[PDB]
Amino acid sequence: MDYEKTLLMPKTDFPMRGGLPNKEPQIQEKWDAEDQYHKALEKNKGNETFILHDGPPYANGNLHMGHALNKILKDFIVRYKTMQGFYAPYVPGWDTHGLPIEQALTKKGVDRKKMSTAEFREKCKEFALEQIELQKKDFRRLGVRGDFNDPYITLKPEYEAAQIRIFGEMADKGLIYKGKKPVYWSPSSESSLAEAEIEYHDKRSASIYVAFNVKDDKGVVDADAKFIIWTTTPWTIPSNVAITVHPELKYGQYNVNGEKYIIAEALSDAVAEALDWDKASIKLEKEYTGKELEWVVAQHPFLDRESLVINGDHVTTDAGTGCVHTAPGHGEDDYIVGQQYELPVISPIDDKGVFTEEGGQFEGMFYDKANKAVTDLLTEKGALLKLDFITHSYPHDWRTKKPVIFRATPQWFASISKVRQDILDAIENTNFKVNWGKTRIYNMVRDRGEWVISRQRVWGVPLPVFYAENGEIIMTKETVNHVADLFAEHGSNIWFEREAKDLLPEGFTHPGSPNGTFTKETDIMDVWFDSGSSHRGVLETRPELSFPADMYLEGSDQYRGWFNSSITTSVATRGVSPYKFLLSHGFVMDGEGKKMSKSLGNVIVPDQVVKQKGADIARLWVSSTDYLADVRISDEILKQTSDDYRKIRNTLRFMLGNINDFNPDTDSIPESELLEVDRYLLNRLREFTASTINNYENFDYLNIYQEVQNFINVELSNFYLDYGKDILYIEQRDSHIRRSMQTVLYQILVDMTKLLAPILVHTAEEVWSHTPHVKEESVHLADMPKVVEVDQALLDKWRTFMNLRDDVNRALETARNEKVIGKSLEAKVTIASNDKFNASEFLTSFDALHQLFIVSQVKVVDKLDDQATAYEHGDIVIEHADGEKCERCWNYSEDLGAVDELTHLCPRCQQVVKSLV
RNA sequence: GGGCUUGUAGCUCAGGUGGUUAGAGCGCACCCCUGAUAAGGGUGAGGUCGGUGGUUCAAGUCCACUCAGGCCCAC
Ligand SMILES: C/C(=C\C(=O)OCCCCCCCCC(=O)O)C[C@@H]1OC[C@H](C[C@@H]2O[C@H]2[C@@H](C)[C@H](C)O)[C@@H](O)[C@H]1O
Ligand SMILES: [K+]
Ligand SMILES: [Mg+2]
Ligand SMILES: [Mg+2]
Ligand SMILES: [Mg+2]
Ligand SMILES: [Mg+2]
Numbered sequence: 001m002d003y004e005k006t007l008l009m010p011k012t013d014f015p016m017r018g019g020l021p022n023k024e025p026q027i028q029e030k031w032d033a034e035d036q037y038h039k040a041l042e043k044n045k046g047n048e049t050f051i052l053h054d055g056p057p058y059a060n061g062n063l064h065m066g067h068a069l070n071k072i073l074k075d076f077i078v079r080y081k082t083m084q085g086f087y088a089p090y091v092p093g094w095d096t097h098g099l100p101i102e103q104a105l106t107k108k109g110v111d112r113k114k115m116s117t118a119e120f121r122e123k124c125k126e127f128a129l130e131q132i133e134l135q136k137k138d139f140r141r142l143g144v145r146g147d148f149n150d151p152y153i154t155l156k157p158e159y160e161a162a163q164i165r166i167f168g169e170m171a172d173k174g175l176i177y178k179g180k181k182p183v184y185w186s187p188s189s190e191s192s193l194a195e196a197e198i199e200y201h202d203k204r205s206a207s208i209y210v211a212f213n214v215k216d217d218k219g220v221v222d223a224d225a226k227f228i229i230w231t232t233t234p235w236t237i238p239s240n241v242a243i244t245v246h247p248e249l250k251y252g253q254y255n256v257n258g259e260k261y262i263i264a265e266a267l268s269d270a271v272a273e274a275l276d277w278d279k280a281s282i283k284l285e286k287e288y289t290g291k292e293l294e295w296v297v298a299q300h301p302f303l304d305r306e307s308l309v310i311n312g313d314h315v316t317t318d319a320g321t322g323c324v325h326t327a328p329g330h331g332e333d334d335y336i337v338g339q340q341y342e343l344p345v346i347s348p349i350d351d352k353g354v355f356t357e358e359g360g361q362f363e364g365m366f367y368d369k370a371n372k373a374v375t376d377l378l379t380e381k382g383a384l385l386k387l388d389f390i391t392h393s394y395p396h397d398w399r400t401k402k403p404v405i406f407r408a409t410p411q412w413f414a415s416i417s418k419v420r421q422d423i424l425d426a427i428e429n430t431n432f433k434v435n436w437g438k439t440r441i442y443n444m445v446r447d448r449g450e451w452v453i454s455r456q457r458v459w460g461v462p463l464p465v466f467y468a469e470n471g472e473i474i475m476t477k478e479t480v481n482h483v484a485d486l487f488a489e490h491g492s493n494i495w496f497e498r499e500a501k502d503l504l505p506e507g508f509t510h511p512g513s514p515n516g517t518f519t520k521e522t523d524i525m526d527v528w529f530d531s532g533s534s535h536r537g538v539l540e541t542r543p544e545l546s547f548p549a550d551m552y553l554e555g556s557d558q559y560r561g562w563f564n565s566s567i568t569t570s571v572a573t574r575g576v577s578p579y580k581f582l583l584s585h586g587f588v589m590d591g592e593g594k595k596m597s598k599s600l601g602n603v604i605v606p607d608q609v610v611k612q613k614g615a616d617i618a619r620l621w622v623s624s625t626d627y628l629a630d631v632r633i634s635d636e637i638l639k640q641t642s643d644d645y646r647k648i649r650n651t652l653r654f655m656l657g658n659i660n661d662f663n664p665d666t667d668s669i670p671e672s673e674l675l676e677v678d679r680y681l682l683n684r685l686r687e688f689t690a691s692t693i694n695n696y697e698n699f700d701y702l703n704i705y706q707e708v709q710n711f712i713n714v715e716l717s718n719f720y721l722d723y724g725k726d727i728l729y730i731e732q733r734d735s736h737i738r739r740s741m742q743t744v745l746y747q748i749l750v751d752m753t754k755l756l757a758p759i760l761v762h763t764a765e766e767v768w769s770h771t772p773h774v775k776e777e778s779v780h781l782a783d784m785p786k787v788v789e790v791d792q793a794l795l796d797k798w799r800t801f802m803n804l805r806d807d808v809n810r811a812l813e814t815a816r817n818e819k820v821i822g823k824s825l826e827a828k829v830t831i832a833s834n835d836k837f838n839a840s841e842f843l844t845s846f847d848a849l850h851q852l853f854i855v856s857q858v859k860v861v862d863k864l865d866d867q868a869t870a871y872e873h874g875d876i877v878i879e880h881a882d883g884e885k886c887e888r889c890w891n892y893s894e895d896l897g898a899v900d901e902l903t904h905l906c907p908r909c910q911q912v913v914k915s916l917v
Numbered sequence: 918g919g920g921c922u923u924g925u926a927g928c929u930c931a932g933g934u935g936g937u938u939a940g941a942g943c944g945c946a947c948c949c950c951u952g953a954u955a956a957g958g959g960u961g962a963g964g965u966c967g968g969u970g971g972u973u974c975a976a977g978u979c980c981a982c983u984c985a986g987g988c989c990c991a992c
């Protein structure tokens with residue numbers, strides 16, 4: 001007859017293959033339907049709280065692997081805290097203002113000039129919300145649990161109003177002020193431009209050398225040797241302002257003939273070389289320290305009146321002559337280092353290349369031809385020049401293809417310098433996972449210049465400022481807070497819909513404008529300000545949250561980004577960091593650790609990992625990366641992830657099928673009555689559990705990925721589950737020995753699925769769904785197993801038994817290569833003490849060595865002759881087992897018997913079978 | 918160029934105060950099993966630690982320089 005019918009084979013419909021791309025949507029569908037997000041919250045209703053504040057991704061485009069890495073790590077954290085009983089609301093957010101979106105619309109074919117600000121802004125909003133829906137869909141497909149149905153958005157009235165109140169408070173503490181800054185300006189478009197509207201094209205520029213003297217006397221500290229000058233911009237000459245000097249680097253030359261001017265060290269060679277001067281390459285003499293040449297007061301001719309100073313510099317040396325000269329009226333950093341000191345803003349020029357003030361003969365022409373021929377009047381006619389024509393790449397208006405120039409424009413600033421030390425101190429009191437995180441942002445805030453907070457665009461939050469003709473600036477608590485009031489109720493659009501007096505309080509009045517009339521600012525705030533105020537607009541505003549967030553977690557680029565604008569803004573108005581803990585991760589690279597491009601074809605997108613392999617696979621990958629640095633993804637990397645996932649899943653499947661008939665409520669064996677081998681695994685489970693919780697407490701998911709594998713592969717699959725077959729399949733269903741293993745098997749099943757739940761969200765649920773008798777619905781609404789003390793002596797004892805098992809297996813291998821044995825069951829193992837190990841005594845405290853080694857018989861003797869091979873754990877002798885093969889359990893027995901139609905059954909199996917019938 | 922950061926076996930990772938033949942899991946090779954079967958067991962082969970030079974009796978582990986990466990600036 002057939003023996004398999006009497007066997008107890010595993011039973012479960014839990015599939016070996018995941019089918020993730022088709023199973024996960026259903027599971028997600030159910031989680032939403034049963035509003036688990038809010039259920040998870042009410043489950044921990046009055047417990048300690050954990051607030052992880054989400055940084056708002058930009059509402060434009062497709063999520064990339066970075067969004068996935070970042071969101072999945074966040075979910076790990078909140079899920080684990082939730083599973084430890086913490087009330088941990090996770091509310092995603094979206095960054096919705098900014099130039100990029102205005103551009104998307106324009107590129108889409110919207111066209112501002114043809115509808116008005118109000119209609120264009122609504123178009124931006126409509127677009128942002130559409131993008132959000134798409135992104136929200138993708139985020140949820142990763143298995144992330146969060147308030148996705150009621151996320152915070154920077155375009156929401158309440159958020160905008162909060163942002164305004166932040167602007168108001170900073171303005172009150174005197175941290176907001178109006179000034180000016182140079183910006184790309186297109187005389188063609190009669191408007192300023194951002195780098196995104198700039199494209200380079202070669203241009204004909206007449207470069208000249210205007211060597212200017214060093215009169216006065218304050219600068220005659222070292223002779224009266226003139227200071228040369230070279231500008232590729234003749235119109236950038238009527239801007240008499242300082243010169244240059246890169247501290248440390250010195251040299252002055254002072255050479256024969258001419259006037260013994262000044263060049264430089266690494267410059268000299270490539271300086272006079274083109275100066276046409278080479279009257280016997282005359283040698284230098286009295287070089288006078290560059291760096292130290294500060295305040296070397298020098299009158300710069302051409303029709304000057306003021307002498308130009310010189311201060312520290314940042315980047316000057318190169319093919320470009322050592323003589324730079326400045327004029328904050330038309331220069332990027334030419335304005336920074338050139339302003340700290342009493343410096344008057346130079347040059348005019350209206351929205352058109354035309355100027356007026358200070359302009360001599362050229363009082364109404366342009367910045368071009370009015371130079372190359374006009375201003376070229378004032379040149380070598382006293383400053384020794386060399387009018388040359390050169391070609392180089394130059395900034396151009398991308399639509400008009402015409403040249404762009406720098407021009408100082410009124411801008412608004414946030415006074416970082418006044419709150420600097422305050423931010424530094426808040427950082428010092430901020431916790432970090434790694435010390436360099438603290439150092440990076442520290443030096444950041446330390447070397448940070450003033451914050452330009454204004455932009456001349458329409459898609460954003462308006463600076464709540466009003467102007468009173470007579471002078472200007474109306475920015476008081478009353479005015480800002482009333483604007484906040486309106487914004488809170490109508491949103492920012494109100495600003496573009498109403499007149500100034502409608503945006504002002506109760507029939508407001510001010511000394512300015514005796515006629516009760518007012519003007520309003522038009523600039524909007526920099527988007528960094530928008531997100532940077534998220535701690536106010538969401539943490540302080542929403543009921544479920546609390547201002548100081550337990551932590552912020554984002555990419556490395558946020559040290560200059562959201563981490564920075566958020567702390568700057570929070571310290572300014574609250575005096576504290578908006579985050580008690582700052583955790584950052586790296587970027588996602590390809591397999592070689594190189595940037596994903598597209599021209600290179602090494603991208604890999606989240607949407608594809610999910611569709612092709614599954615969200616649970618994208619997640620396991622995350623847990624396996626050392627996120628504190630850059631991480632790497634590729635097809636070979638993911639094939640690995642797939643292979644580990646299959647092993648975890650398959651192992652869980654086997655355990656599931658073998659506890660299908662186990663009812664914990666009535667079949668469990670007391671710990672004190674478990675077979676010792678079962679108590680050993682129960683303790684390996686406790687050890688693995690303790691270790692994993694610790695890892696979760698430290699955000700060390702990589703350690704869990706590593707340990708889970710070793711526990712699943714080595715302890716379970718390789719050993720316990722294998723050895724268990726001779727028990728689970730053969731013993732009587734309700735026998736003490738079978739129920740003892742099931743008792744531990746069940747606990748491991750349950751606990752391990754719970755311990756993995758934060759990571760393998762879908763599979764954990766699917767396994768939970770196939771486990772009999774689990775209390776709660778959903779693993780995700782259950783608590784982590786409690787950490788208990790392990791029996792260390794039991795562990796050491798079995799650790800040694802395991803190392804002894806390896807020697808046996810080695811002995812079994814040798815014998816198997818010799819065809820002496822096939823499966824380990826056809827073997828008889830004899831072992832005895834060695835000089836290296838007292839095997840005989842040690843093996844005395846173990847039961848059923850034959851089952852433990854998966855062999856038919858084990859004989860412990862005491863001593864073996866010089867036939868037995870020696871092992872680290874004793875001498876071992878392997879030979880084919882005695883007796884005949886029992887057709888049921890496949891162990892060899894010398895006492896096979898028949899039970900009715902079933903022959904060749906060992907005594908053990910005869911008993912099990914007889915109890916069937 | 919500046920701040921911070923990474924480089925150990927095919928892959929992902931371990932390797933306190935420097936000290937015998939650098940560890941793990943997977944993968945791979947070969948063998949066994951065929952009662953987890955688009956499964957399972959076993960053995961074994963692979964790194965000299967990005968490079969060079971030093972400190973030291975002795976360095977993956979300390980120093981210097983260097984190569985190739987990464988984020989953010991300077992640009
Ligand atoms: C880890 C990251 C990128 C990455 O890993 O790079 C992924 C690879 C890019 C894909 C390449 C495409 C081809 C392009 C080509 O051709 O070159 C960065 C992080 O991202 C996630 C989150 C985004 C939020 O909005 C940011 C917020 C906080 C602030 C308020 O704005 C944030 O945490 C951010 O710091
Ligand atoms: K088999
Ligand atoms: Mg680790
Ligand atoms: Mg294995
Ligand atoms: Mg390597
Ligand atoms: Mg490697």
Ligand SMILES: [Mg+2]
Nearest residue numbers: 626629930931
């Ligand atoms: Mg590492």
Ligand SMILES: [Mg+2]
Nearest residue numbers: 943944945961
């Ligand atoms: Mg191996």
Ligand SMILES: [Mg+2]
Nearest residue numbers: 965966967968
């Ligand atoms: Mg080498």
Ligand SMILES: [Mg+2]
Nearest residue numbers: 970971972976
């Ligand atoms: Mg050496």
Ligand SMILES: [Mg+2]
Nearest residue numbers: 971972973974
């Ligand atoms: Mg020596």
Ligand SMILES: [Mg+2]
Nearest residue numbers: 932933935978
């Ligand atoms: Mg060491």
Ligand SMILES: [Zn+2]
Nearest residue numbers: 199200201202
């Ligand atoms: Zn061109």
Ligand SMILES: [Zn+2]
Nearest residue numbers: 886889906909
């Ligand atoms: Zn039997």
